[PDB]
Amino acid sequence: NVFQTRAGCLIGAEHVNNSYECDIPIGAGICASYQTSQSI
Amino acid sequence: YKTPPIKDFGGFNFSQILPDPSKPSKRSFIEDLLFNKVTLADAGFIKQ
Numbered sequence A: 001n002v003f004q005t006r007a008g009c010l011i012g013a014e015h016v017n018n019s020y021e022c023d024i025p026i027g028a029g030i031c032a033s034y035q036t037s038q039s040i
Numbered sequence B: 001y002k003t004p005p006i007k008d009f010g011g012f013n014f015s016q017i018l019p020d021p022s023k024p025s026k027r028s029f030i031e032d033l034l035f036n037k038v039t040l041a042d043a044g045f046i047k048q
Ligand SMILES: *[C@@H]1O[C@H](CO)[C@@H](O)[C@H](O)[C@H]1NC(C)=O
Pocket: A004, A005, A006, A007, A008, B046
């Protein structure tokens, strides 16, 4: 689940294509949340 | 709110400050000038 952003390399969270009111600010317009199995 | 679809405001010219859909950013001419004036120092966010 390696993902590349402009704030750094993120390991442990899968990348999606939707856009909601973001939960945890990562940076550079990228946020993260805990959703559904269960994952980040 | 989306930018106005038609431009008949009555003679007033807003193309100077409205965004131009010609560059990968939505910055107008004034915004581009203002960005070009001040220079940053962090040099991006990635330095391996
Ligand atoms: C990774 O290096 C490449 C150049 O080979 C560059 O396109 C990219 O900007 C670098 N990664 C980030 C997040 O900037």
